[PDB]
Write a protein that binds this ligand. Structure first.
Ligand SMILES: Nc1ncnc2c1ncn2[C@@H]1O[C@H](CSCC[C@H](N)C(=O)O)[C@@H](O)[C@H]1O
Ligand SMILES: Nc1ncnc2c1ncn2[C@@H]1O[C@H](CSCC[C@H](N)C(=O)O)[C@@H](O)[C@H]1O
Lengths: 234, 234
């Protein structure tokens, strides 16, 4: 009963060809494709076969998402769900999973290249430098939505190791405040990547002091990955 | 002068098909392939064309590695260098880079799926759970080689968020000590993945108290990715 099956595909950072081999194969053969997220390309979007039912989720509600996927499955069809990057990182795949596995689905997750990785790449930075830092911290700035209590950016910034920030592009005023309160220099390097591996990509290199200016002058207000730390210097 | 060029390819966690699309294309057309690391499959190894000169590096010394690559380049040949996972994470690509760019090379890095990601996948864990934790910490246990001072595992374990440990498989006695000294419960979940996405893979799920036993009973002494934290529970 291999229709009863979810694949969760990691679609890569943006470029159509950072999709693993296997991710591309599935994507090709799926009958219903669910692209949650507007952070996939029109061009990933467009390799599924002709036929495919395509659906946007995100603005859909748990239980509806889930039942649509169960209906299609019952139907004998091949469903797949397409997350940007690697689903394990701020994917939200957990709750669907558990509903799903109750109705016996099998899951299969198909890892991805996360945009962390794509940003470092663009810049040509390893994130780990012997003697310098051996830790990379991947988190998000608190905005409205507060973060758990022992995870604040100030306190995660006191190990001084490379910090890589998802969903924070328009919180660079907090970002600098917490870095300075954990006592980073105002000179430590920042690099921002804007749509990495998109044909619109922008690479901004800058520093804690200028962050917010850099952002707002480059007009990067979304999709940007911010690496901050002395491994991004030279 | 597009022979003067390094691609740094991320080869994925193990399976031949977690290699991005583009990584596979390069790998196909390269004249000299440099696989540093014995952590690639015999089967990635084996898609390069017939012809290819294949070289193992690692036990080679900086400047030799570099000059061999420059000689081949001069020669008009297509070189590529194949790191496991994503090179940005404990890649060591930095020093080659800089020598290289001096002799004017261009680099191109081709991101990857890092084994972080592959482990979470196998287990079916998102690493980020709203209300639970929003931070994933990627580091390594200190062995002989000490880690920088503000990065110790105890102190990185006091945010209580998912911690993912590369190269520490045979340091699970320190691992439990530092987790317990940062006051984790002895019950918080551990999952180890052993050769993830290899055909030998092993998934061990266990807890801080049993870690070291789990390891030594499963006999996992190498290639293992250890995720530790309440998102790996259920
Ligand atoms: N191509 C891209 N360029 C840079 N960052 C992007 C990006 N796509 C993903 N992001 C980041 O990811 C956030 C979406 S959260 C989804 C992230 C994802 N699962 C991944 O693994 O990459 C955005 O705020 C930005 O922080
Ligand atoms: N398939 C695999 N299974 C689990 N972990 C592995 C692995 N391959 C990489 N590792 C980990 O990576 C360490 C090598 S350091 C190289 C890691 C790499 N650049 C990556 O991105 O995945 C090993 O100690 C183990 O900690």
């Amino acid at each position: 009963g291999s229709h009863m099956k979810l694949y969760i595909i990691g679609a890569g950072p943006g470029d159509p060809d950072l999709i693993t081999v296997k991710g591309l194969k599935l994507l090709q053969q799926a009958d219903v494709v669910l692209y949650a997220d507007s952070l996939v390309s029109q061009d990933l979007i467009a390799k599924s076969k002709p036929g495919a039912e395509v659906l946007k989720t995100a603005g859909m509600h748990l239980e509806e998402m889930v039942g649509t996927m169960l209906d299609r499955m019952r139907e004998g069809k091949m469903v797949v769900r397409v997350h940007t990057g690697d689903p394990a990182m701020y994917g939200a795949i957990m709750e669907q999973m558990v509903l799903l596995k109750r109705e016996g689905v099998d899951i299969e997750i198909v890892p991805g290249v996360t945009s962390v990785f794509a940003a470092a790449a663009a810049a040509e930075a390893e994130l780990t430098i012997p003697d310098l830092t051996q830790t990379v911290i991947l988190t998000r700035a608190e905005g409205r939505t507060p973060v758990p209590e022992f995870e604040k950016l100030t306190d995660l910034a006191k190990h001084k190791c490379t910090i890589a920030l998802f969903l924070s592009s328009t919180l660079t005023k907090k970002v600098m405040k917490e870095f300075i309160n954990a006592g980073w220099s105002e000179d430590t390097p920042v690099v921002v990547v804007y749509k990495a591996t998109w044909p619109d990509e922008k690479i901004v290199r800058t520093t804690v002091k200028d962050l917010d200016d850099a952002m707002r002058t480059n007009g990067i207000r979304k999709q940007a990955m911010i690496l901050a730390g002395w491994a991004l210097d030279p």
